[PDB]
Structure 1
Amino acid sequence: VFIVDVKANKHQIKQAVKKLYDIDVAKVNTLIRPDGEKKAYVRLAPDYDALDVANKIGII
């Protein structure tokens, strides 16, 4: 789950997550918070692990 710019669509979100984190994503579920910022749910590919990635991100 990330906070992204409101001007970025699911395609750019998927490309950005895939390139700047070196992971493969399955689908992106997006919504705009009442605060006014986008929230992206990025489902990883089954051969990737979110806990594995979240460790390397540092948000564990």
Structure 2
Amino acid sequence: KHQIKHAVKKLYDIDVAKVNTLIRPDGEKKAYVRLAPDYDALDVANKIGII
């Protein structure tokens, strides 16, 4: 949880409140990074190309 939180703070320069990791049934770990209230996940998702 510390590596994932520190990685997204460097790839996109966004602060994260908490991270919830989860290993999917197919062996892939899935994370739920909750951004700080000063940042909007809708704007970040449009910059990095999610939407």
* 1:1-31 per-position Cα deviation (integer Å, ceiling 9, x unaligned): xxxxxxxxx0000000111111001000010
Which consecutive residues of structure 1, in runs of 5 or more, have no partner in the other structure? Answer: 1-9
Q: How many residues align?
A: 51
Greater length-normalized contact order (CA 8 Å, ≥ 6 residues apart): 1
TM-score of the aligned structures, taking structure 2 as reference length: 0.97
TM-score of the aligned structures, taking structure 1 as reference length: 0.83
2:7 aligned partner = 16
Identity across matched positions, percent: 98
Backbone CA RMSD of aligned residues:
0.4
Per the TM alignment, residue 59 of structure 1 is displaced from its structure 2 partner at its CA by 0.7
